């Protein structure tokens, strides 16, 4: 019966196994050097010690070591744009603290962790934190009551517990009860909780948290700045090891054109993998700079001029006449009727006949499904509004040069 399976799942007594491969994975020594760089360059392979994040490592390490040794509890808020080494640094600090507590240089501590985007509801965090404690799956009300019984009541020998919370802005909602509980539990003396909260926006406690929640979040804070031109080069040359499969100018061009956009490290580690895959099909064993230029042009794509050049001729006449009506009437939003009149003018100039308006609505629907233009549902023909989504100069660049 299924109910015994669900009871063994909710009690945690069966581990959720995944199916194993029929065939064994290939041995490491059969790999090419370019494949070795392709697998060292994967974003999932976190280094044991992160380059160019030593200052933030010392900051989070000093905070967590002081909160653990003082047995007091508290809270911290780290923030920054995605791909800047936030969660990797926090888990590296926590792994270093666990390695130190294993050798009895530090007091032992529990390490709970959650993430706000793995929860369907903000209150489901109560289900998950308790699942990192006892392992039972229970309802969020009973889990919140048991967590309050654990944290509000002094029960020696209570051990220190560090609750990392990624994705803090998803847990907010309007009532903000969950984030208030998670930041209010450390303030009680009986709970030794040290909650760290990772988020993207710098101004989150003032922008969307309540005043008491911002007051509980405190003034200790850390900001992960975007990677510069040089740190992105140090990251990729640390990932490659001593291998010369990448040219140094190729990594310099990847870092120079990724740091100018975002400062994300995942973009550099993905563009270098695509450059390795491009160099693999050319049967070269060094990733020369034009392979990096091809991978950069592929992964920072701008394929709308190709879409306008690949459109059918009546759709190109339609794309000319929408920009013509925008230039004529001045306002950016045009009705289909004046667009069709400019269509008849341009088609009378070019000499081809144009399809009747019931087929011009099919052309407008195709351009609006391709998102070359923004357009309404077709049920209100001749009065539907047609925004131009592509820029007006891109159409002339496509249909002239």
């Amino acid at each position: 019966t299924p109910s015994q399976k669900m009871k063994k799942i909710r009690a945690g007594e069966l581990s959720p196994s995944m199916q194993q491969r029929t065939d064994l994975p290939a041995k490491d020594s059969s790999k090419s050097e370019l494949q070795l760089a392709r697998e060292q360059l994967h974003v999932s392979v976190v280094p044991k010690s992160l380059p160019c994040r030593e200052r933030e490592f010392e900051n989070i390490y000093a905070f967590l070591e002081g909160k653990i040794q003082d047995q007091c509890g508290g809270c911290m808020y780290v923030s920054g744009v995605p791909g800047t080494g936030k969660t990797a640094t926090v888990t590296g600090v926590i792994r270093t603290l666990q390695r130190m507590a294993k050798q009895n240089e530090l007091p032992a501590f529990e390490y709970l962790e959650i993430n706000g985007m793995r929860l369907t509801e903000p209150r489901q965090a109560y289900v998950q934190i308790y699942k990192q404690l006892t392992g039972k799956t229970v309802s969020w009300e009973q889990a919140h009551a048991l967590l309050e019984k654990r944290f509000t009541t002094p029960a020696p020998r209570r051990v220190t517990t560090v609750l990392l919370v990624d994705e803090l802005d998803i847990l907010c909602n309007r009532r903000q009860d969950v984030v208030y509980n998670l930041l209010d539990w450390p303030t009680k003396s009986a709970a030794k909780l040290v909650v760290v909260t990772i988020a993207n926006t710098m101004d989150l406690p003032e922008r969307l948290l309540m005043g008491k929640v911002t007051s509980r979040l405190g003034l200790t804070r850390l900001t992960f700045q975007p990677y510069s031109h040089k740190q992105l080069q140090e990251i990729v040359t640390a990932r490659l090891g001593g291998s010369e499969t990448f040219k140094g100018e190729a990594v310099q061009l990847v870092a120079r054109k990724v740091a100018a956009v975002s400062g994300d490290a995942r973009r550099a580690l993905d563009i270098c993998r695509r450059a390795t895959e491009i160099a693999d099909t050319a049967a070269v064993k060094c990733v020369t700079m034009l392979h990096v230029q091809q991978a950069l042009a592929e992964m920072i794509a701008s394929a709308k001029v190709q879409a306008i050049r690949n459109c059918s001729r009546m759709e190109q006449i339609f794309l000319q006449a929408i920009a013509a009506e925008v230039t004529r009437t001045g306002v950016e939003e045009t009705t289909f009727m004046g667009v069709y009149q400019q269509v008849e003018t341009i088609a009378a100039f070019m000499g081809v006949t144009f399809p009747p308006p019931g087929r011009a609505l099919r052309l407008c629907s195709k351009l609006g499904a391709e998102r070359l233009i923004i357009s309404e549902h077709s049920r209100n023909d001749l009065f539907q509004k047609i925004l131009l989504n592509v820029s007006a100069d891109d159409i002339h660049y496509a249909l002239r040069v």
Binding site: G358, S365, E370, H377, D381
Partner: protein, 398 residues
């Protein structure tokens, strides 16, 4: 595909081209079907009856599973999926259950069989114009149900509108458009004259009149009568069922001089121009209380006389809005008797509103606060009739 068109053509005169196109696209079940067909036309063009007779003949003659729908019935998508799978998965009983669009696609994927038996499926959706008003994932899935279910099915759609009305923001898959043209006068005469044996039998079961009718009710007589009928009635309507239901009554009036002993056209053209004024009305004086009559003509003057003219008429575009106190002021000005403001008078105001003699153009939520705006919704001739029965001459105040 030949037997179906041969079996539908006697039932449907002047539709040999549409029946030929339907029997080429979805006639044989061994041949693969187009992914969707959309035939369209006016009212009375005969598309519901044509797809019903076609689906019935294909289901009786061949292996196909047919499913006819009316999309007005499907206020939620679950109703449509449950009826569609009740027809395409027969004898499932009350154990049938469909949660959403995905369960419908999976249970239709289970219905696939071997290619030797050459099974097919057919889905007709009458009133398909309502499909664009619902969940906005029903129509795109219905236009590619064959690709999704991996199954030899065509989804016919039926509407009074062209398919140019049906495109959405996300686009649509390809469809085979088909047009049912409405008939001209000659084909309409052939269609009205195709039921001649039925009306001849109906007269022969209804005794000198029996022999004098059966010796003179031959095919040229009914054709000349239908020519005299369509010479006057085709200007107002091309709708074939309306022409049938009026032409039978007009023949019942027309036939009398023949039974009683050209030379017919004037005697019918009297009544024939009277039946022309009763077209679309399918038929086979509002008494009121006295103070309700005065309230109704006061509301007509309030909606017809504008706000500025009351000061000159009573101190002694469209219909205008009026507040209830303006109605009571005009009612007391035209009453010249001065009854008290009892409960029954304002109750007459509310029950004139409930009969759609007045209307609530705004307000509604606050009738009592004085922010309500009413609008009289009757014609002038009813007001003049009420003023005749009452004795209040309305035209003095207009």
């Amino acid at each position: 595909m030949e037997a179906i068109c041969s079996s539908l053509e006697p039932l449907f005169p002047c539709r040999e081209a549409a029946i030929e196109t339907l029997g080429e696209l979805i006639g044989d079940s061994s041949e693969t079907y187009p992914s969707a067909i959309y035939l369209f036309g006016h009212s009375g063009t005969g598309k519901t009856a044509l797809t019903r007779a076609f689906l019935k003949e294909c289901g009786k003659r061949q292996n196909v599973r047919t499913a006819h729908l009316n999309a007005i019935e499907c206020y939620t998508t679950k109703i449509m999926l449950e009826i569609l799978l009740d027809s395409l998965a027969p004898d499932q009983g009350d154990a049938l259950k469909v949660d959403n669009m995905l369960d419908f696609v999976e249970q239709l994927r289970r219905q696939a069989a071997t290619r030797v038996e050459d099974q097919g499926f057919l889905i007709a959706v009458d009133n398909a114009e309502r499909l664009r008003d619902m969940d906005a994932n029903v129509l795109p899935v219905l236009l590619r149900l064959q690709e999704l279910t991996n199954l030899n099915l065509c989804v016919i759609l039926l509407s009074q509108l062209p398919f140019e009305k049906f495109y959405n923001k996300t686009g649509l898959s390809e469809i085979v458009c088909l047009h049912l043209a409405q008939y001209n006068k000659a084909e309409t005469q052939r269609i009205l004259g195709s039921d001649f044996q039925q009306v001849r039998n109906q007269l022969l079961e209804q005794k000198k009149r029996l022999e004098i009718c059966q010796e003179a009710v031959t095919e040229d007589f009914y054709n000349n009568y239908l020519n005299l009928f369509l010479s006057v009635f085709y200007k107002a309507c091309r709708d074939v069922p309306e022409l049938q239901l009026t032409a039978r009554k007009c023949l019942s009036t027309y036939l009398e001089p023949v039974l009683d002993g050209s030379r017919l056209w004037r005697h019918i053209a009297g009544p024939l121009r009277s039946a022309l004024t009763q077209i679309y009305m399918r038929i086979e004086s509002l008494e009121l209380p006295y103070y309700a009559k005065f309230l109704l003509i006061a509301a007509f003057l309030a909606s017809h006389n504008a706000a500025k003219q009351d000061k000159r008429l009573f101190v002694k575009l469209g219909p205008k809005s009026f507040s209830i106190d303006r109605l009571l002021a005009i009612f007391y000005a035209i009453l010249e008797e001065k009854v008290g403001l009892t409960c029954n008078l304002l109750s007459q105001i509310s029950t004139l509103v409930h009969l759609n003699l007045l209307s609530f153009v705004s307000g509604e939520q606050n009738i009592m606060e004085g922010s309500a705006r009413l609008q009289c919704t009757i014609g002038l001739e009813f007001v003049l009739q009420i003023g005749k029965v009452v004795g209040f001459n309305v035209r003095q105040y207009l």
